[PDB]
Amino acid sequence: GKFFNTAVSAWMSQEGPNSDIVLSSRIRLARNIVDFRFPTLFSSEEAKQIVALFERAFVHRPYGEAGRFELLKMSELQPIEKRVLVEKHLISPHLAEDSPFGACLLSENEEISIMINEEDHIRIQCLFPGLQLAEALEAASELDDWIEGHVNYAFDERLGYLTSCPTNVGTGLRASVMMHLPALVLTQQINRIIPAINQLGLVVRGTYGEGSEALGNIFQISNQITLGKSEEDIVADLHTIVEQLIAQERAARQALVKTLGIQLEDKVFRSYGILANCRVIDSKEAAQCLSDVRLGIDLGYIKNVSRNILNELMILTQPGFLQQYAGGVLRPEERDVRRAALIRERLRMETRL
Amino acid sequence: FFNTAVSAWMSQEGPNSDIVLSSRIRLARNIVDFRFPTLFSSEEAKQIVALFERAFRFELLKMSELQPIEKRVLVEKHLISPHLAEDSPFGACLLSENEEISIMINEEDHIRIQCLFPGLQLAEALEAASELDDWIEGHVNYAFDERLGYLTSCPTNVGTGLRASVMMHLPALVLTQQINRIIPAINQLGLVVRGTYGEGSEALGNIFQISNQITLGKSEEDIVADLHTIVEQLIAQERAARQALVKTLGIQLEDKVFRSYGILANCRVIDSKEAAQCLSDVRLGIDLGYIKNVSRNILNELMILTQPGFLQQYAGGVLRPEERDVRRAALIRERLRMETRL
């Protein structure tokens, strides 16, 4: 399967602005279709009719340089295929786990993922590498008007796009950035920054882990406000705070180099040595060591290792990709052995080059 | 004599050399017509060195001609004792070209004959030491009492003047915490156990020296035979504990030794205690066949090369405490790269 082969698409592997700290930018637009009940209330026959509506209008349809759209029906996917789409960030856990007649319209280049029958009938997602919030909003807005030519959105003049989701009321817009902030975590500035960010109207969560955890020091920053503010203003305010976070993380990295010197070089190389040689490693230690190694690459200590090892190995070591790597279902202890072996082989391949 | 950490002779593979790093025989004697080293004058010390210089391929190293760093390196290679390096201003050492034989002059006693063999070769070392003992006896007259044996000042040498010793790597008995049980059992049997590295009770790198406590009243052959039998029991117990660790831990043990390799191959700062523990782990991984591309001699060589004297030689000058951990790490990294490139 084309979409299931790779952890990160060619599109997302491009270098974008500030790609050392900002992994990616995302615009999501939620809408519901007139004359169908909300997903909270509709029947499976209604869900099927929505999928059939989108198939009629868009399957195999060209979208210019993005290629044609492919329709992936949740009713036709194995659970492991669904899990891989989640780990690639192409579909949500809600779509994979809770939408039996869900679907995803995927552009051939994997820039565009339109979820069908999630918490709203439609969730338009546009993904860009690095910090490209303006470009992703323009792409999502153009796609939004293009879809609206074939489907009729439920829209109210005062309340905006109708939805059952309190966090989508109004614009239906969620803008977010994925950021690697190892220096702010190590200097313990995060527990100060998060409450400050909430005051400015933004939300922070960890991409990986459980609860308040942010394994690999990878964080997602998004807007909280969706009603009473223009989409452009929502995105411009996020962009401002993100650029402030980039400068604080860069400042913290230079402070660590000055304060720790050879001790920091020792820390990132020890993590490299563990990843390159261990035979058993759990998810928490692997993510931490991968974060350390990326920091070492960014700062220039670690040479001859592509920085994309963080992006790619964080995804490839998730349970679905790990089962695919191993060729079959894995028990708990085999998982830690397979995880170490996958990382070892990748780092060995980096040395050969 | 100052260039390598282990000679070509001592780098050869010996019997049971997976566990036994080396075997040593020391014979202490004093010469008639000279006062004991605890009381003699510097002019007497010079006359003893001159006597041996005439009697003697063996190269003669005079302590009065060596810089302090040169003496320290000889101690770290095990060729001379700390007492010779630090307390014998007119001591000397006759060193064989292959560094198997070392005759120390004006240490605790006028003459100390040392024979060092790789692996477990106590009888071979005793024969070589006895041949040299007889030969020296043809040129001097030993102070000897019919009841007390060779006259000495050190109580631990009274009688035969024989110290027999074996240096062993016992990581599995340490990891399973058998050591504090075996040591009382060995003491009861007439032997003493000390850690080669560290201060006090610690044995850095899990390297232990087992030696005789009894010197008076037992024959030299019986002393060595008894030591050899208990070493062989220790060898069997260590080998069985290694096999048991493999059955119990499997991939978790492979993980432990490769993580220590990963640290040593890449770290930039490492202290003496962590370096010794990781080096012991890597040697265990080599012995068990998990680590297949690194010579097992790295434990022997790197424990010596990372001692303060060799480390200063490696660096080119005196080292502050924090610079020592950086140089130690760099030295290990470079040695391990040497193994990897091959």
UniProtKB/Swiss-Prot annotation, chain A:
**Enzyme class, one word?**
transferase
Classification lineage: Bacteria, Bacillati, Bacillota, Bacilli, Bacillales
Summarizing the annotation, the consequence of altering residue 208 to A is:
Loss of protein kinase activity
Q: Which domain of life is it from?
A: Bacteria
| An example molecular function term from Gene Ontology annotations | creatine kinase activity
Q: Know anything about its domains from the record?
A: In the 3D-structure the McsB dimer adopts a flat 'domino tile' shape, with the two active sites opening on the same side. Individual subunits are composed of the N-terminal catalytic, ATP:guanido phosphotransferase domain (PD, residues 1-263) and the C-terminal dimerization domain (DD, residues 264-355), which are linearly organized in a PD-DD-DD*-PD* manner (asterisk denotes the partner protomer). The PhK-like catalytic phosphotransferase domain is structurally adapted to target protein substrates.
Query: Any idea of its EC number?
Result: 2.7.14.1
Q: Which GO terms fall under biological process for this protein?
A: phosphocreatine biosynthetic process
Query: Cross-referenced NCBIfam families, in alphabetical order?
Result: PRK01059.1-4, PRK01059.1-5
Instruction: State what inhibits or activates this protein.
Output: Appears to be allosterically activated by the binding of pArg-containing polypeptides to the pArg-binding pocket localized in the C-terminal domain of McsB.
How is the subunit organization of this protein annotated in UniProt? Homodimer. Dimerization is important for full catalytic activity.
Q: What does this protein do?
A: Catalyzes the specific phosphorylation of arginine residues in a large number of proteins. Is part of the bacterial stress response system, where it is involved in regulating the global heat shock repressor CtsR; phosphorylates arginine residues in the winged helix-turn-helix domain of CtsR, thereby preventing its binding to DNA and consequently inducing the expression of repressed genes.
* Keyword list, A-Z: Allosteric enzyme, ATP-binding, Kinase, Nucleotide-binding, Transferase
Residues annotated to bind ATP = 24-28, 89, 123, 174-178, 205-210
Instruction: Write down what this protein is called.
Output: Protein-arginine kinase
Could you say what the effect of mutating residue 165 to A is? Loss of protein kinase activity
The record's Gene Ontology cellular component field reads: extracellular space
The gene it comes from is: mcsB
From Swiss-Prot, chain B:
Asked if the record carries the keyword NADP, the reply is no
Pfam families with a match to the protein in the record: ATP-gua_Ptrans
Q: What is the effect of changing residue 78 to A?
A: Loss of protein kinase activity
Q: Which terms in the GO cellular component ontology are assigned?
A: extracellular space
Query: Which Gene Ontology BP terms does the record give?
Result: phosphocreatine biosynthetic process
Q: What effect is documented for mutating residue 194 to A?
A: Loss of protein kinase activity
| EC number, UniProt record | 2.7.14.1
Residues where ATP binds: 22-26, 78, 112, 163-167, 194-199
Effect upon mutating residue 108 to A: Loss of protein kinase activity
**Where are the annotated coiled coils located?**
none
Q: Which GO terms describe its molecular function?
A: ATP binding; creatine kinase activity; protein kinase activity
Activity regulation comment: Appears to be allosterically activated by the binding of pArg-containing polypeptides to the pArg-binding pocket localized in the C-terminal domain of McsB.
Chain span(s) of sequence motif RDXXRA motif of the pArg binding pocket involved in allosteric regulation: 324-329
Sum up the protein's function in the record's words: Catalyzes the specific phosphorylation of arginine residues in a large number of proteins. Is part of the bacterial stress response system, where it is involved in regulating the global heat shock repressor CtsR; phosphorylates arginine residues in the winged helix-turn-helix domain of CtsR, thereby preventing its binding to DNA and consequently inducing the expression of repressed genes.
User: What is the designated name of this protein?
Assistant: Protein-arginine kinase
Q: What organism is this sequence from?
A: Geobacillus stearothermophilus (Bacillus stearothermophilus)
